[PDB]
């Protein structure tokens, strides 16, 4: 069913965002949703290379950090690398096969490209602060606390792609596979898409900004400044990324794109809320691991958990969800200088 | 079977290029094949925006062209747009799911990103030379001569992806689907990959350079100079693209990556040769359409067909194939100024 160039001459302005006729001609003179066009332009205007940031000073800082402050910084840096390793590949393998409008197709691909620059910047930092980078990269796969968030986040992607395959190959209806019962449903497939986008919105808008705060806390003490300068560029990119998933969710929810999405977006509003909750608690439990051996000036388990609730409320309000925590003010306002 | 983050701690240096364990951690301190790393760096170093090229002068040239010279330029520009519309999305949807080494995964994604810039540049040109861009973009889908090359090139992609889905969901062996006989084979799946890469190598290394010559022929007469300046940047990118598919083919063929690929690369050497032949003839027949209503100073059906054979020999020699045409010198040496 899927084609890398659909031969039908369709009006791309009336196609839905997802599950419509796959995009054939890539044109940029017209947009159904002009937000994705200007996200492309903003992201292109922000193009930066990791190597233009001097991280050479961060080796001295890192060796001077006490062992627990090393553990805080390295554990936070490894989580960032795991996160954008998944964000490097997943938007292309998962969203691209489903897009039916050209402006969104290009943004998803530009979005994923920006994540490879983020991934390369993490290598740049690691190479310049530790003696053996292999130890860092290998722990990312074999860290018990890291594998928890890793397999949960990827499942929203994998379940979408595996069901994408059943749909492109069979279509709707109940099918038989070696005697097994396979019932492919379009509503169930787009149910897995909406949830996936909700998960990715929490990843970029909530989980990553927890790490930014941890990275800038070192910057506030005038430590790991090369690292912080890079995170400043990552953060400015992340703002575009969460904005994109925000409009995608709101447009599908409003029924203007797909009216069938409106009913599905309400039917799964509970599990969307519950997803953001589990993500927030997972980040709280992560702070217990970060400060397992102690804390540092400007950041501890308590202060960070307040920033989790603070940012979680904001992001959930922008996607039309109810707030799960007390409406409180910013516990670390110094972070706004870096954003 | 596919996962956006494989949880096994594997030595990414010993993984094959394709069909191995999917990449988990994205690291850039080490490379199995360092060619893909330096292709990433070169492509990043070439980053350019379509809008920094002044095409405003090309509207006057285009309106001054006689009707057949309009037809030559517009037909060539539409083919370029069709070509890079497919190259915008296909490398991500088709190759990325199969890559098992991080340096190749990122290059495929950077490669596809550069193609979106190419696609955006074609819109930039079209917007500035014609009154109604819709007529141009709509003909790309509904052009009898364009649909010929369109459905042929995409088939190498689509057949690979559709079989990718059967393999990730079932694995090797014979399966039953609603009573139908489905026999998934790993050798057959990687047979469709090698051929696909051969097709994409001809696309970028042979078909596109036929269009470059047509575009620079206007530049030689001092016409459509904004257009030509952009094609200069496209061409410099295309050289990296064909180089990447060249190493991918040679490495698989040599058996150093996958020894099983070596035997398959020889077993399908005939259909690889035949594929490059059909592509060359398709480009020749295209020149009959380009110069259907007449020719122009510096380029006609005869001269272009000589450049087809000339470039086809070179590209086939670099992928270890036999030469199908007479070994002759460059018929349009002025093109080297633009490359
Ligand atoms: Fe990122
Ligand atoms: Fe991001
Ligand atoms: Fe291109
Ligand atoms: Fe290319």
Short mmCIF file of C-alpha atoms in Angstrom, two decimals, chain B residues 39-279:
data_model
loop_
_atom_site.label_atom_id
_atom_site.label_comp_id
_atom_site.label_asym_id
_atom_site.label_seq_id
_atom_site.Cartn_x
_atom_site.Cartn_y
_atom_site.Cartn_z
CA UNK B 39 30.85 12.17 4.41
CA UNK B 40 28.83 13.50 7.35
CA UNK B 41 31.49 16.14 8.02
CA UNK B 42 31.81 17.19 4.37
CA UNK B 43 28.04 17.42 3.91
CA UNK B 44 27.68 19.45 7.12
CA UNK B 45 30.48 21.72 5.92
CA UNK B 46 28.57 22.37 2.66
CA UNK B 47 25.33 23.54 4.34
CA UNK B 48 23.60 26.17 2.19
CA UNK B 49 20.15 27.78 1.92
CA UNK B 50 18.30 28.20 -1.40
CA UNK B 51 17.28 31.75 -0.48
CA UNK B 52 20.84 33.08 -0.40
CA UNK B 53 20.96 32.71 -4.21
CA UNK B 54 19.39 35.56 -6.17
CA UNK B 55 17.18 33.95 -8.81
CA UNK B 56 15.30 37.20 -9.47
CA UNK B 57 17.07 37.67 -12.81
CA UNK B 58 15.93 34.28 -14.12
CA UNK B 59 12.33 35.41 -14.74
CA UNK B 60 13.44 37.76 -17.52
CA UNK B 61 15.62 35.08 -19.12
CA UNK B 62 12.81 32.53 -18.95
CA UNK B 63 10.23 34.81 -20.56
CA UNK B 64 12.76 35.62 -23.29
CA UNK B 65 13.46 31.96 -24.08
CA UNK B 66 11.66 30.71 -27.19
CA UNK B 67 8.87 28.24 -26.51
CA UNK B 68 10.98 25.13 -27.13
CA UNK B 69 13.83 26.44 -24.97
CA UNK B 70 11.25 27.06 -22.25
CA UNK B 71 10.12 23.45 -22.72
CA UNK B 72 13.71 22.19 -22.40
CA UNK B 73 14.38 24.11 -19.18
CA UNK B 74 11.03 23.42 -17.52
CA UNK B 75 11.03 19.73 -18.45
CA UNK B 76 14.54 19.33 -17.04
CA UNK B 77 13.64 21.23 -13.87
CA UNK B 78 10.53 19.09 -13.33
CA UNK B 79 12.54 15.87 -13.64
CA UNK B 80 15.06 17.12 -11.07
CA UNK B 81 12.17 17.88 -8.71
CA UNK B 82 10.62 14.44 -9.17
CA UNK B 83 14.02 12.83 -8.60
CA UNK B 84 14.85 14.62 -5.35
CA UNK B 85 11.25 14.31 -4.13
CA UNK B 86 11.89 10.56 -4.03
CA UNK B 87 15.41 11.08 -2.66
CA UNK B 88 14.01 13.34 0.05
CA UNK B 89 12.07 10.57 1.80
CA UNK B 90 13.27 7.21 0.45
CA UNK B 91 16.76 6.86 2.06
CA UNK B 92 15.15 7.28 5.49
CA UNK B 93 12.11 5.05 5.02
CA UNK B 94 14.07 2.36 3.14
CA UNK B 95 17.68 2.18 4.39
CA UNK B 96 17.44 3.44 7.98
CA UNK B 97 15.37 0.46 9.31
CA UNK B 98 18.15 -1.90 8.16
CA UNK B 99 21.35 -0.18 9.30
CA UNK B 100 23.31 -1.72 12.17
CA UNK B 101 26.26 0.69 12.52
CA UNK B 102 25.96 4.25 13.86
CA UNK B 103 28.13 6.10 11.34
CA UNK B 104 26.07 4.79 8.43
CA UNK B 105 22.76 5.48 10.19
CA UNK B 106 23.66 9.16 10.59
CA UNK B 107 24.96 9.54 7.03
CA UNK B 108 21.76 8.11 5.55
CA UNK B 109 19.83 10.67 7.62
CA UNK B 110 22.15 13.55 6.72
CA UNK B 111 22.01 12.46 3.08
CA UNK B 112 18.20 12.51 3.09
CA UNK B 113 18.22 15.91 4.81
CA UNK B 114 20.43 17.44 2.12
CA UNK B 115 17.84 16.24 -0.40
CA UNK B 116 15.13 18.32 1.29
CA UNK B 117 17.29 21.40 0.76
CA UNK B 118 17.55 20.38 -2.89
CA UNK B 119 13.76 20.01 -3.04
CA UNK B 120 13.26 23.44 -1.43
CA UNK B 121 15.67 25.00 -3.93
CA UNK B 122 13.59 23.68 -6.83
CA UNK B 123 10.52 25.41 -5.37
CA UNK B 124 12.55 28.61 -4.96
CA UNK B 125 13.45 28.54 -8.66
CA UNK B 126 9.95 27.63 -9.88
CA UNK B 127 8.30 30.37 -7.80
CA UNK B 128 10.54 33.00 -9.39
CA UNK B 129 10.25 32.11 -13.10
CA UNK B 130 6.63 31.11 -13.75
CA UNK B 131 3.37 32.83 -12.88
CA UNK B 132 1.48 29.74 -11.63
CA UNK B 133 3.70 27.17 -9.86
CA UNK B 134 0.74 24.78 -9.55
CA UNK B 135 0.89 23.93 -13.27
CA UNK B 136 4.52 22.85 -12.92
CA UNK B 137 4.09 20.70 -9.81
CA UNK B 138 0.91 19.05 -11.10
CA UNK B 139 2.51 18.04 -14.41
CA UNK B 140 5.24 16.20 -12.49
CA UNK B 141 2.67 13.64 -11.35
CA UNK B 142 0.71 13.52 -14.64
CA UNK B 143 3.50 13.61 -17.23
CA UNK B 144 3.56 10.44 -19.32
CA UNK B 145 7.31 10.69 -19.90
CA UNK B 146 7.91 11.55 -16.24
CA UNK B 147 5.75 8.75 -14.82
CA UNK B 148 7.87 6.24 -16.77
CA UNK B 149 11.05 6.99 -14.83
CA UNK B 150 9.07 7.72 -11.65
CA UNK B 151 7.42 4.33 -11.13
CA UNK B 152 10.56 2.45 -12.17
CA UNK B 153 12.89 4.18 -9.71
CA UNK B 154 10.47 3.95 -6.78
CA UNK B 155 9.92 0.21 -7.31
CA UNK B 156 13.47 -0.55 -6.17
CA UNK B 157 12.58 1.31 -2.97
CA UNK B 158 9.03 0.03 -2.46
CA UNK B 159 9.84 -3.65 -3.02
CA UNK B 160 12.64 -3.35 -0.45
CA UNK B 161 10.42 -1.75 2.21
CA UNK B 162 7.46 -4.07 1.67
CA UNK B 163 9.78 -7.05 2.09
CA UNK B 164 11.41 -5.37 5.09
CA UNK B 165 8.00 -5.47 6.76
CA UNK B 166 7.53 -9.20 6.12
CA UNK B 167 10.96 -9.92 7.61
CA UNK B 168 10.73 -7.81 10.78
CA UNK B 169 7.31 -9.33 11.51
CA UNK B 170 7.89 -12.99 10.58
CA UNK B 171 11.57 -13.78 10.04
CA UNK B 172 12.88 -16.38 7.65
CA UNK B 173 10.81 -19.39 6.60
CA UNK B 174 7.53 -20.01 4.83
CA UNK B 175 4.42 -18.47 6.39
CA UNK B 176 0.67 -18.55 5.77
CA UNK B 177 -1.28 -15.31 5.34
CA UNK B 178 -5.04 -15.87 4.89
CA UNK B 179 -4.12 -19.07 3.07
CA UNK B 180 -1.57 -17.34 0.82
CA UNK B 181 1.98 -18.68 0.59
CA UNK B 182 4.57 -16.22 1.93
CA UNK B 183 8.21 -17.36 1.97
CA UNK B 184 10.46 -14.77 3.63
CA UNK B 185 14.16 -15.19 2.87
CA UNK B 186 17.08 -13.18 4.22
CA UNK B 187 19.11 -13.69 1.03
CA UNK B 188 16.14 -12.54 -1.06
CA UNK B 189 15.66 -9.49 1.17
CA UNK B 190 19.30 -8.45 0.90
CA UNK B 191 19.10 -9.18 -2.82
CA UNK B 192 16.48 -6.43 -3.00
CA UNK B 193 18.80 -4.12 -1.02
CA UNK B 194 21.86 -4.50 -3.25
CA UNK B 195 19.76 -3.87 -6.37
CA UNK B 196 18.12 -0.87 -4.70
CA UNK B 197 21.51 0.69 -3.94
CA UNK B 198 22.57 0.02 -7.53
CA UNK B 199 19.45 1.85 -8.74
CA UNK B 200 20.04 4.79 -6.39
CA UNK B 201 23.66 4.95 -7.55
CA UNK B 202 22.52 5.30 -11.16
CA UNK B 203 19.91 7.88 -10.13
CA UNK B 204 22.38 10.18 -8.41
CA UNK B 205 25.52 9.46 -10.45
CA UNK B 206 24.03 9.18 -13.97
CA UNK B 207 20.48 10.52 -14.21
CA UNK B 208 21.13 13.70 -12.23
CA UNK B 209 24.33 14.58 -14.09
CA UNK B 210 22.35 14.40 -17.33
CA UNK B 211 20.18 17.15 -15.85
CA UNK B 212 23.18 19.15 -14.63
CA UNK B 213 24.49 19.26 -18.20
CA UNK B 214 21.12 20.48 -19.43
CA UNK B 215 21.01 23.15 -16.70
CA UNK B 216 24.58 24.33 -17.24
CA UNK B 217 24.04 24.53 -21.00
CA UNK B 218 21.79 27.50 -20.28
CA UNK B 219 24.48 28.87 -17.95
CA UNK B 220 27.02 28.67 -20.80
CA UNK B 221 24.83 31.02 -22.86
CA UNK B 222 24.61 33.30 -19.77
CA UNK B 223 20.95 32.42 -19.18
CA UNK B 224 19.15 31.18 -16.05
CA UNK B 225 22.24 32.01 -14.03
CA UNK B 226 20.46 32.00 -10.67
CA UNK B 227 19.24 28.49 -11.47
CA UNK B 228 22.76 27.41 -12.45
CA UNK B 229 24.30 28.81 -9.27
CA UNK B 230 21.94 26.61 -7.25
CA UNK B 231 22.64 23.53 -9.38
CA UNK B 232 26.33 24.12 -8.63
CA UNK B 233 25.54 23.59 -4.94
CA UNK B 234 23.27 20.64 -5.70
CA UNK B 235 25.98 19.05 -7.84
CA UNK B 236 28.63 19.35 -5.12
CA UNK B 237 26.22 17.60 -2.75
CA UNK B 238 25.37 14.93 -5.32
CA UNK B 239 29.06 13.98 -5.52
CA UNK B 240 29.01 13.01 -1.84
CA UNK B 241 25.74 11.12 -2.32
CA UNK B 242 26.99 8.91 -5.14
CA UNK B 243 30.27 8.39 -3.27
CA UNK B 244 28.32 7.02 -0.31
CA UNK B 245 26.35 4.54 -2.40
CA UNK B 246 29.62 3.66 -4.15
CA UNK B 247 31.36 2.57 -0.95
CA UNK B 248 28.23 0.78 0.26
CA UNK B 249 28.13 -1.27 -2.94
CA UNK B 250 31.87 -1.98 -3.07
CA UNK B 251 32.06 -2.97 0.61
CA UNK B 252 29.13 -5.39 0.31
CA UNK B 253 30.52 -6.76 -2.96
CA UNK B 254 33.99 -7.34 -1.51
CA UNK B 255 32.58 -9.63 1.20
CA UNK B 256 34.49 -7.76 3.91
CA UNK B 257 31.27 -6.48 5.48
CA UNK B 258 29.01 -9.48 4.87
CA UNK B 259 30.64 -12.55 3.27
CA UNK B 260 27.15 -13.71 2.28
CA UNK B 261 26.78 -10.45 0.33
CA UNK B 262 29.80 -11.33 -1.82
CA UNK B 263 28.11 -14.41 -3.28
CA UNK B 264 24.83 -12.54 -3.78
CA UNK B 265 26.56 -9.57 -5.41
CA UNK B 266 28.03 -11.87 -8.07
CA UNK B 267 24.81 -13.85 -8.55
CA UNK B 268 22.95 -10.63 -9.43
CA UNK B 269 25.75 -8.91 -11.38
CA UNK B 270 23.83 -9.51 -14.61
CA UNK B 271 20.67 -7.72 -13.47
CA UNK B 272 22.81 -4.91 -12.01
CA UNK B 273 24.46 -4.42 -15.40
CA UNK B 274 21.07 -4.62 -17.13
CA UNK B 275 19.65 -2.06 -14.69
CA UNK B 276 22.34 0.50 -15.53
CA UNK B 277 21.71 -0.17 -19.23
CA UNK B 278 17.96 0.44 -19.03
CA UNK B 279 18.62 3.60 -17.02
#
